[PDB]
Amino acid sequence: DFPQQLEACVKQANQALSRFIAPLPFQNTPVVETMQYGALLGGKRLRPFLVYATGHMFGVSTNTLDAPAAAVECIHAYSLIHDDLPAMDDDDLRRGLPTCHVKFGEANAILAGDALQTLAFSILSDADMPEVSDRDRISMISELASASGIAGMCGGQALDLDAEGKHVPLDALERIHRHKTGALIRAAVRLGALSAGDKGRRALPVLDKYAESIGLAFQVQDDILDVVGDTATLGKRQGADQQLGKSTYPALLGLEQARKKARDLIDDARQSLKQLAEQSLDTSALEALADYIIQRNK
Amino acid sequence: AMDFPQQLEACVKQANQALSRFIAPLPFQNTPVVETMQYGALLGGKRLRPFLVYATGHMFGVSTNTLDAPAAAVECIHAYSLIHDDLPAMDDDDLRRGLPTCHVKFGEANAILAGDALQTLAFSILSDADMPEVSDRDRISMISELASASGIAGMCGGQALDLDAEGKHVPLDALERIHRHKTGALIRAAVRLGALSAGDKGRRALPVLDKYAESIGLAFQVQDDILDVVGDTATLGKRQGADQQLGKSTYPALLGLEQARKKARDLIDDARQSLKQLAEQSLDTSALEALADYIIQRNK
Numbered sequence: 001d002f003p004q005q006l007e008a009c010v011k012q013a014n015q016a017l018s019r020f021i022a023p024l025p026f027q028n029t030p031v032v033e034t035m036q037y038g039a040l041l042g043g044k045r046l047r048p049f050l051v052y053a054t055g056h057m058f059g060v061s062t063n064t065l066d067a068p069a070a071a072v073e074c075i076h077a078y079s080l081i082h083d084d085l086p087a088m089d090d091d092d093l094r095r096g097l098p099t100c101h102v103k104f105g106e107a108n109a110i111l112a113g114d115a116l117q118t119l120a121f122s123i124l125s126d127a128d129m130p131e132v133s134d135r136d137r138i139s140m141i142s143e144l145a146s147a148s149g150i151a152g153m154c155g156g157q158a159l160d161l162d163a164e165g166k167h168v169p170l171d172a173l174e175r176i177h178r179h180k181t182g183a184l185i186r187a188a189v190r191l192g193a194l195s196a197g198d199k200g201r202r203a204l205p206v207l208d209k210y211a212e213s214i215g216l217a218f219q220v221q222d223d224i225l226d227v228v229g230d231t232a233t234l235g236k237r238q239g240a241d242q243q244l245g246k247s248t249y250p251a252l253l254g255l256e257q258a259r260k261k262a263r264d265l266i267d268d269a270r271q272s273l274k275q276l277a278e279q280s281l282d283t284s285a286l287e288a289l290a291d292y293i294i295q296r297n298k
Numbered sequence: 299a300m301d302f303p304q305q306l307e308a309c310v311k312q313a314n315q316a317l318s319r320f321i322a323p324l325p326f327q328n329t330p331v332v333e334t335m336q337y338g339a340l341l342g343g344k345r346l347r348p349f350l351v352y353a354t355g356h357m358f359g360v361s362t363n364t365l366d367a368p369a370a371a372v373e374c375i376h377a378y379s380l381i382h383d384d385l386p387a388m389d390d391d392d393l394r395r396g397l398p399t400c401h402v403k404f405g406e407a408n409a410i411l412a413g414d415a416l417q418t419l420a421f422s423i424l425s426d427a428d429m430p431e432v433s434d435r436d437r438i439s440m441i442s443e444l445a446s447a448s449g450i451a452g453m454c455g456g457q458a459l460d461l462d463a464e465g466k467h468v469p470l471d472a473l474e475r476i477h478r479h480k481t482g483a484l485i486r487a488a489v490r491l492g493a494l495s496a497g498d499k500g501r502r503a504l505p506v507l508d509k510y511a512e513s514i515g516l517a518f519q520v521q522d523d524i525l526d527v528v529g530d531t532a533t534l535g536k537r538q539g540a541d542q543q544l545g546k547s548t549y550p551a552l553l554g555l556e557q558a559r560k561k562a563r564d565l566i567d568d569a570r571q572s573l574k575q576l577a578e579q580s581l582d583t584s585a586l587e588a589l590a591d592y593i594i595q596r597n598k
């Protein structure tokens with residue numbers, strides 16, 4: 001039952017984040033309230049899911065995986081807070097609630113996003129991960145940083161800002177999505193595998209292919225749902241991309257062709273999972289998620 | 299012997315070289331966002347935090363080349379913090395380091411992402427850069443420290459209290475709290491990163507180096523408050539009376555100029571008292587003595 005595994009992942013990840021947010025100073029001040037709101041209230045937690053599902057393949061303990069799970073979700077949550085700001089996408093709705101900058105003001109959203117970024121790295125450097133070597137811990141931190149910064153998520157966000165109003169062609173659009181979305185999703189998978197020493201790293205070339213495909217599919221589905229989704233189901237505004245002239249898969253290719261591309265990427269993702277079930281790994285959660293990425297309505 | 303003004307410039311040249319070396323391999327060169335990081339990180343600034351890193355590591359025989367990593371890292375964090383600080387939602391400044399601020403020059407969006415990227419870059423340097431005499435444990439401790447000094451327990455927490463204190467004329471203890479977090483934490487991290495580069499010898503010095511750093515840390519910000527009142531815009535690189543314009547809670551606003559000055563003097567008195575304990579173990583404290591003094595003698 002995949003919806004129960006989602007649900008359980010959400011609960012598990014939220015307690016992980018709360019564990020790491022609890023010892024922080026300034027509890028019940030605006031800025032920290034904004035971090036909790038942005039990190040913990042709503043969300044599918046698909047990236048934590050990727051961390052846990054990857055790590056679980058190699059038999060690493062869930063409790064260990066809480067660290068990298070919470071960390072990728074901190075980067076993710078920070079990314080949404082900034083992405084909603086007036087200078088960026090100017091959204092007032094996210095996860096069925098007023099966005100961070102709307103409820104707490106711009107200054108607090110900005111700072112809460114900054115602080116969440118930093119918390120991702122406190123967690124990866126300070127958290128208990130019993131069976132993870134120092135060298136491996138450094139590799140997780142290195143990967144998360146590269147995936148989140150100008151070579152990954154921030155760099156894609158900048159390609160996205162520059163492509164507003166230009167209706168860039170397919171190759172450039174692929175480049176935007178792979179960076180702004182794909183990179184962090186590949187970091188999730190990679191953090192899961194990096195928790196698992198030699199066997200985890202032996203799976204990386206293939207898990208990489210898997211991650212690059214679901215990562216891109218995830219963003220084209222995000223683009224598709226922006227066009228055809230209900231504001232009430234999505235938790236954020238239908239038509240937000242059209243309204244700003246964002247370059248997207250549906251705007252360029254139309255809906256049918258964009259759905260077709262997302263399906264091609266999941267077919268390919270499934271091929272890469274087929275190679276892992278040959279290294280004796282149980283890919284069942286990673287397959288269910290890959291389907292879910294393009295079948296979901298939120 | 300020792301000629302502070304040329305050490306300061308050599309440190310700027312060395313830190314800029316280090317920053318540059320870590321930015322060059324990055325993708326999207328000559329695009330608005332990397333232009334914004336380069337502008338905000340490299341064009342001007344005193345590089346006092348890198349000075350702290352270098353000077354501290356040098357006391358323990360640590361190689362300058364190794365120290366380029368933590369030093370560029372603390373300066374990456376510092377630079378990001380300024381870009382976000384000047385934003386219209388924050389301090390709404392149009393002028394820094396003699397030039398238009400990143401948001402005026404590049405747009406708000408580009409300034410937010412440049413800042414975001416510079417923070418991340420800080421952690422990519424500490425995780426990736428070569429640091430041959432530094433152990434894994436010490437590199438993790440460098441990351442953990444920069445992290446807790448940069449976020450809500452340090453610089454960001456400090457910026458949020460600063461923002462909350464606008465128009466609220468907070469008393470001395472709450473003002474000290476603001477300054478120790480928003481400014482102190484990162485200067486202390488520069489010192490800690492220098493010491494952690496030296497492994498065990500550096501760790502044994504931390505209790506004391508912390509006392510030093512805690513005092514120059516606070517001093518830094520009270521002198522920054524004083525300079526906001528009495529400084530020439532053209533010398534500061536930033537607008538005189540910006541604090542007074544936003545109702546910021548500052549040392550001079552609360553205590554007046556004489557008393558803020560005296561508090562800065564007293565904190566450097568204390569900072570140099572701590573450094574005497576380190577010179578007693580035959581560590582050369584002269585560069586940190588000199589910097590402590592420059593922190594309240596400076597006019598920018």
Ligand SMILES: CC(C)=CCSP(=O)(O)OP(=O)(O)O
Nearest residue numbers: 079080083089153157180181
């Ligand atoms: C926020 C980041 C880095 C990426 C996602 S793209 P987006 O602006 O389309 O995201 P939403 O549709 O706003 O959820």
Ligand SMILES: CC(C)=CCSP(=O)(O)OP(=O)(O)O
Nearest residue numbers: 379380383389453457480481
């Ligand atoms: C920029 C950070 C984190 C702290 C310093 S306080 P400030 O806003 O007074 O600094 P400036 O005077 O704007 O340089």
Ligand SMILES: CC(C)CCOP(=O)(O)OP(=O)(O)O
Nearest residue numbers: 042043044045046095181222
């Ligand atoms: C497309 C994207 C990177 C922005 C939102 O991603 P998401 O649909 O996983 O958002 P949630 O965390 O709210 O589920």
Ligand SMILES: CC(C)CCOP(=O)(O)OP(=O)(O)O
Nearest residue numbers: 342343344345395481522598
């Ligand atoms: C007061 C403060 C922490 C912000 C500016 O610090 P600073 O005077 O070192 O600024 P520079 O990097 O421009 O020298």
Ligand SMILES: [Mg+2]
Nearest residue numbers: 083084089091
């Ligand atoms: Mg958005």
Ligand SMILES: [Mg+2]
Nearest residue numbers: 083088089160
């Ligand atoms: Mg966006």
Ligand SMILES: [Mg+2]
Nearest residue numbers: 222223226241
């Ligand atoms: Mg979208």
Ligand SMILES: [Mg+2]
Nearest residue numbers: 383388389460
């Ligand atoms: Mg300020």
Ligand SMILES: [Mg+2]
Nearest residue numbers: 383384389391
């Ligand atoms: Mg300011």
Ligand SMILES: [Mg+2]
Nearest residue numbers: 522523526541
């Ligand atoms: Mg100031």
